[PDB]
Every structure is written in structure tokens, then in C-alpha cells.
Amino acid sequence: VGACVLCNSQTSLRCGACIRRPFLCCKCCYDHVISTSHKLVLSVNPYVCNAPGCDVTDVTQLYLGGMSYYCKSHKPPISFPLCANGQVFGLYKNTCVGSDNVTDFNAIATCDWTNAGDYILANTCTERLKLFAAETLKATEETFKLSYGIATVREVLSDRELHLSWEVGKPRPPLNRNYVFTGYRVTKNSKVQIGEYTFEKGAVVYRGTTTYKLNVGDYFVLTSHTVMPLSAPTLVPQEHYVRITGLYPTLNISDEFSSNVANYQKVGMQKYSTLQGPPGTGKSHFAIGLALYYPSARIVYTACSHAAVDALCEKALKYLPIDKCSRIIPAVECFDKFKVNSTLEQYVFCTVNALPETTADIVVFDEISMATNYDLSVVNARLRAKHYVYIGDPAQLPAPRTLLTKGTLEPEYFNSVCRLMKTIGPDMFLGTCRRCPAEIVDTVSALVYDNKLKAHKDKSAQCFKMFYKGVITHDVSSAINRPQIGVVREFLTRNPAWRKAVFISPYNSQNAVASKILGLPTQTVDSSQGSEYDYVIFTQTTETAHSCNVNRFNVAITRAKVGILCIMSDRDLYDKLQFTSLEIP
Ligand SMILES: CC(=O)Nc1ccc(F)c(C(=O)O)c1
Ligand SMILES: [Zn+2]
Ligand SMILES: [Zn+2]
Ligand SMILES: [Zn+2]
Predict the structure, then answer these.
(1) Which residue owns the Cα nearest ligand 1 atom 5?
(2) If you take atom 6 of ligand 1, which residue's CA is the nearest one?
(3) Measured between alpha carbons, how far is 462 from 533 in angstroms, rounded to an integer?
(4) Residue 570's domain is classified under what CATH number?
(5) SS3 (DSSP) at 216
(6) Span between the terminal Cα atoms of the chain, in Å
(7) In which domain, by residue range, is 452 found?
(8) Where in the cell is it found?
(9) What element of type H or E holds 30?
(10) What is the rounded CA–CA span in Å between residue 152 and residue 77?
(11) 361-395 burial, b if ≥16 CB within 10 A, otherwise e?
């Protein structure tokens, strides 16, 4: 028994064909089964023919006879159809409201999540269907991971370099960072974990979490997880106040946090607030300063990634008493300078998935662009807070959507928070970039920030762009542009100072070839998010949707403190770069 995900009406029915088995009311179950392929219905029991070796499961071909379910062919003379009167038969028949249209629910229930349109719907439907969609998508993502073949160590060539044998009649996952494996040793009658791993083309390179002397018949699978049901909204109902509520402003604050005093007061005067922090504008400084402005406030700092949490930890360690901080860790190497798993500590740093059920004066949820609606709901379920602050940048990268192949995901569809920030605007904006030369700031100010982002630094004059398509080769899941690397090679010979540069591209394969040819450290745009370097060399590699995506371009060029070389495939983004043009040697 439970609540219908369309009406809320009490019900004894779940759709057995839906992967999350959502409770549907007599009417909503009916409208769902007759307008889709979903015909298996579950109650206290499953609506299936309780006849011996009858296969009939379709509820519309089934009848209650006695206290058992039968099809047409096996039913007793005294029976009634389970599925008639615009209703499916279960408890609480007399309390059932229905809906005008069941169309959004059916689309969520039946879509394969390969098209942007599925995520648009998941983010504009009713709040109750946002949760259904978020569960459904996530269960679908975890199942897609099982669809991948096992990789088995066929030969150890060296340290860090292997030969894999792949399970026949199942696809191989992409060999990039967005696919994290887990090793396993063959035991008497079982298997035991041996740390997570990632692979890249060579033979394959592997950069595992822990170190080992792994040997033949050792195997690797992407760890999939049980997805729990969601209950809490993606956002609590908003409230505006006429005074700061449940918080006590400090009387003395350092001129280090004085720029955020108005913002800090705004946090205290509504239930939740959104802070758009562009690259290098002081998001973690904001987040910790909030503790100093409200010194008695119990604050839970959360984010999706251990790295995002640890960065809040590093910033805390420098401003907050260490004995008032705790890092929550469940039973990967993260931040180890705070007492571990002390929930009742004033300052709690903890990833979304490991959050305890607790209260707080303020919840700071950082790197919000990377959050899914699933994450947003979990936080609301675990943390009852007086104030929620959502910090991030809808102009930066979202969580990879492993299943999305067709269409682009616009930032207003990344999650409910980014939706608000893109529709009504952010509550608070960090308007001054301290990281980047003015050429980069000016470029992205106009590209994605509506000319509201201001440079601290002057022009560097070390910001260059070259228009060069070169030559694109494709391997199994990546792109390579050797001539764009050649242009970088010739540039470096005439500009040896740039040998301190980081190499960035939209493709792991481009990066692997650049690494060998240039010896620069490499990053994907996606892995560079949150990092900064003095000098950046960027090869666009292709002009795909992937490589021209404005959020990815934005992250790519805002990594640079001093200089950047952009080797561009795309005339559009080339013409938007406010950088000195260089001809081709
Ligand atoms: C058949 C197969 O995929 N194997 C396998 C082994 C260990 C695991 F832990 C997982 C897993 O986490 O899904 C999967
Ligand atoms: Zn269904
Ligand atoms: Zn209903
Ligand atoms: Zn039957």
C-alpha cells in the first residue's frame, strides 16, 4: 500500500513494468496500462493468472475469481475483470481522484533517457514526477553499467600497463575517467574487492585508487548500486523573511569577508538562496565566510564529489577551529585533518550520498551544476535546515549523463537549482574574477555571464588563438587531432616559457597523444573544473556539439591565471575569443 505518484490518492497497486514500480491509484494505474505497453500490475500480490502453467500477466486480460487472479481461459464462472470502469481493481477504490493528463508520467515511465527531451521533461514536470524521473533515470543508468562486459587481465605487460580480454556478446565501456571500474581476485567460492580503477588506451594504461601486484584472471566491472526511493522535494518551499531568521550576525568580521556581508544577510532572510560563482570569484571563500559571519550557526557543507567536499575542508582548515569541524566518511582517500564521523560537530563536511539524518542552521550545497535532482532530493531528505545555500555556476559543467546521446542539455535543465538560476536568476552573484587575465574574463563575461563578470587582473597579453582544423581521427570512443598537437609543438619550440603549461582538450585520446608528444601534464575540460594553472594550451580537436559546448568552452579557458593558447576548430567560438590571433607556420 502507498501513495499514487500522480494523485497522491492512497492505493494497493504498483505498475510492475515500470523499473521503480511506482504506486498508481485505481484511475492512474488504468490510464497508464491502457495508454502504454505496461500491463503487469502489483498489489499486496502480483496481478498474474494463478492457474498452473498459464503465462497471462496483462491486467486487461485478467479477472478476480474467488481470491485468486485468472485470465479469460482459466477463470471460475463467478469472477469480475481486474481492469474495467476506467479503473484497475485494488484497495481504496472509493478514495481515488485521477488526473486530466497522464502523458508526462507515461513518457518518464517509458523513455530510454538517450534524448535531451527526456531530461527537459524530468526537470519541468510536477515536483512529484521530478522524483519519479530522477529515480527512474538513475536506476536506468545503474542497469546500463551491468550491460557492459567484464574485462579480465589476460597478460601483465608492465606496471600501469595491461592486456584485457573482454566478455563476448556485451559492449565494452569507454576507457575514460567517467568510467571508474573495480578489480577482483578469484577466490575458492567467491570474489573480494581490490580497489576501484580507471583505464585509457595504450594494451591499456590503468591508474587505480590503491596499489597492488595484480595478476592474470583478475577482472574489472563498473560497480553498480541499489537506487533508493526519493521522498523529499528537489527544493523545499521558498520563504522570504523580514529579519535574518535563526542566525546571529557577528559584531566583528575581517575585511577578508566584508564583500559578502550583504549576501550573508540575504542568506539569513530566505529559506534557500542561490549563489552563482563564476570561475575564480570566491565560492569556497563565500561558503567558509558564512561560518565567520554567523559564528554560533551549525553548518553542514555538502557536495556530490569528495574533491568538492575536501576543497571546502581545505578552506575551512585555514579559517575555522579544527575541533569544531568533522569530515563524514562512510565505511577513496579524502580529507583527514578533522575528527571522522562526528555528526554533532558544529561544522560537518560530507558528500551527498554519505549525509546523516541531522538538522543544521545552514546547509551549504557546493558545486550545484554537478548535482542531479536525485542529489537535491537526498539532501532535503537527510538535512532539515533553517537555511539552504546552493553554490555553483550553471555556466560550468553538469554531471555526465552516461545515457544521453541525442541533443544538448541546456543549463536550465541540469537540476531544479540551475533551473531557478537560469529562469528567475541567481539570488547572489560573485561578479569579480580574481583568477584570469582580462582577455579570458571579457570573453566569458559576454559568452555566458551577460557581461556581468568583471576582471580583477589586467590584460596579460599572453592570450592567443589559432584557427586550424587540422585532421580528425576517431578511435573507439574519442577523437584525436595530431596536426593541432603539431601546431602546439612548433609554438612551444618558439615559446619555451609555455613548457610549464597544462594541456587541455575535450578528448582523453587527444590528451594521451599530446602527453607523449609534448610532455605537458594533461586534463580533460571535465576533469580540469575547479583547478587553475598559470598557462593553458587548449586544442578543440573537433567542432562537435561536445567540443563547442559553451559551458565546456567556459571551463576550458577559465583555468588560466596568466596565459592561454587556444587552437580552435570552430569559427564561431574562435571569433568569440578576445585573444591575439596567430597565423599557421
Ligand atoms: C557479472 C558482473 O558484471 N560481475 C560483477 C562482479 C562484481 C561486482 F561487484 C559487480 C557489480 O558491482 O556490478 C559485477
Ligand atoms: Zn509502468
Ligand atoms: Zn492516481
Ligand atoms: Zn490463465
Answers:
(1) 221
(2) 221
(3) 13
(4) 3.40.50.300
(5) coil
(6) 73
(7) 438-581
(8) Host endoplasmic reticulum-Golgi intermediate compartment
(9) helix 26-34
(10) 58
(11) bbbbbbbbbbbbbbbbbbbbbbbebbbbbbbbbbb
